[PDB]
């Protein structure tokens, strides 16, 4: 068993959404596999309604990178919670002999999952 | 960052439930922290209805052990699925300065979660 | 010849670790016969294993539930491939009463036996 | 003196990496005034930043949406603490038409200015 290696994202520590919030704002993230072995990854957000990602999961060989899309729906800042949203990237090494298709089971099995959060900062 | 150390369970690879299945059968598991640092752990089962565990989560200092309880509800083998149930133990190192109380957030943060499954074998 | 009998578990009994506690398992015996029978249990480790009851009588289609019991023991060191439980049965004799008697065993009668081996899961 | 104007974002504009793609952000300007105004935008990096429109006129309570744009650039190497966007506004003159004219700027009139600095998130 090996701990999945590291990944590099951009922005590296967080992500900022800028007002106005009456339009569907679609930013972008870059993920790169900074490890020695293939890995599969999947994303989770704090708001299924408000947040969206595409693609939502996948597989990267070492040093491979992917450009994914984060969106925002219209909303009303004046009354909701904005100090608490986030985007989590969970990953793990893919199994010997696996195909370039993501399989959730890879996370259920016996092993280790690595996690990275990128908080959402709302700039009004 | 450190990968959470290993844990030792007993039985070490699986768990067998023996017929007859018309009574609530309560087996037991032993978990031991075979690492160098405190860890928190929590359990998950394939059947919320049929399976049950107690206690469901906690914290073990190194070399500490816990005896937990797995149950089974009455049921009818002749028609259900028995080749697929399991019990997963997920764990991680607790954070510097944490208290002996389990906090789910420890799994959400930036880091690494370790997983161990103990399949359920039904003996008819 | 005595008729078939049913056991739940049907082929084996599985004991799970840990073994530092004494564990009581339970079995189900059912007389799938047409005639009344007497039955007794025999174990391969009188020191480790234990039964209650160890014999009884069962009107056909009648059930019994027996409690096997396992003592604490060091599993590293001992033989775990040789345990077993044996059940013997035989038709009860014309006009017998609700009382098991060994003696039905010694005779010209047919004795039937079912072997339930013990499996230790470490 | 020209009246207050509202900007969304209200204090700053945040640009997120990566920077290998050209990114268009957008701003909201609202004339919270009682009188009609003219306004123009000034940037701190004519090479990097870009606006459209760069000036216009706004009847009071009227809104405009402008598109800032960011070119590709190497973020390791350059100054990211000095960018900014400046907006200047001033009341439009008695009887003016739907057409911005720089010249309203040179005068005895009051010019107002709002500074929106740029923040680069790496």
Between β-strands D55-58 and B39-45, what pairing exists: parallel, antiparallel or unpaired? unpaired
| Spatial distance between the Cα atoms of D58 and D35, rounded to a whole number of angstroms | 9
Q: Do chains A and D touch (3 or more CB pairs under 8 A)?
A: yes
The answer to whether the CB of D32 falls within 8 A of the CB of D61 is yes
User: Can you list the positions of beta strands (E) in chain A?
Assistant: 7-10, 15-18, 27-33, 39-45, 51-54, 57-60, 65-72, 86-93, 111-123
> Does C26 contact B27 at a Cβ distance shorter than 8 Å?
no
Residues 6+ apart with CB under 8 A from A120: A14, A15, A16, A17, A46, A51, A82, A85, A86, A87
User: Alpha helix locations (H) across A7-119?
Assistant: 105-108
Using CB atoms, which residue from D9, D17, D21 is nearest to A124? D9
Neighbours of A53 (CB within 10 A): 17
Instruction: Report the C-alpha dihedral over residues C1, C36, C111, C104, rounded to 10 degrees.
Output: -130
Q: Which residues form the domain of C79?
A: 1-122
DSSP string, C80-91: -SS-EEEEEEEE
Instruction: Tell me, in Å, the resolution of the deposited structure.
Output: 2.5
> What tokens does A39 get?
């890995």
How far A89 CA sits from the closest chain B CA (Å)? 9
Kind of pairing between the strands at C13-16 and C112-121: parallel
The answer to whether the Cβ–Cβ distance between A112 and B113 falls below 8 Å is: yes
* Positions of E strands within chain C: 5-8, 13-16, 23-24, 27-31, 37-43, 49-50, 55-58, 63-66, 69-70, 84-91, 112-121
> What is the least distance, in Å, from the CA of D97 to any CA of chain A?
29
Residues in chain B: 124
Q: Are A59 and A102 in contact (CB under 8 A)?
A: yes
CA–chain centroid gap for C114, Å, is 8
CATH number of residue B34's parent domain? 2.60.40.10
Q: Which of C66, C62, C56 is nearest to C32 (CA)?
A: C62
Strand partners, A70: A27, A53
- What is the number of other CB atoms lying within 10 angstroms of the CB of residue B71? 15
Residues 6+ apart with CB under 8 A from A23: A74, D26
Contact A124 D26 (CB under 8 A): no
Provide φ and ψ at D38, rounded to 5°: -115, 150
CB B22 within 8 A of CB B32: no
Q: Does A118 touch chain D (CB under 8 A)?
A: no
Number of domains composing chain C: 1
B87's CB contacts (< 8 A; 6+ apart) are B15, B29, B43, B44, B45, B46, B51, B53, B70, B117, B118, B119, B120
* B53 Cβ contact list (under 8 Å, min separation 6): B43, B45, B68, B69, B70, B71, B87
Q: Residue B40: beta bridge partners? A: B59, B92
How far is it, in rounded angstroms, from Cα C56 to Cα D18? 81
Residues of A in contact with D18 (CB under 8 A): 10, 28, 30
B109·A115 Cβ contact <8 A: yes
Under an 8 A CB cutoff, do A112 and B112 touch? yes
């Amino acid at each position: 068993s090996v701990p999945p290696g590291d990944i590099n994202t951009q922005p590296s520590q967080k992500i900022v959404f800028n007002a106005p919030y009456d339009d569907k704002h679609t930013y972008h993230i870059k993920i790169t596999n900074a490890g020695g072995r293939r890995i599969g990854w999947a994303i989770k957000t704090t708001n299924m309604r408000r947040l969206s990602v595409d693609p939502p999961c996948g597989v990267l060989d070492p040093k491979e990178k992917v450009l994914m899309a984060v969106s925002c729906d219209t909303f009303n800042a004046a009354t909701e919670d904005l100090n608490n949203d986030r985007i989590t990237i969970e990953w793990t090494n893919t199994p010997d002999g696996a195909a370039k298709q993501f399989r959730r089971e890879w996370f259920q099995g016996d092993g280790m999952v690595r996690r990275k959060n990128l908080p959402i900062e709302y700039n009004l």
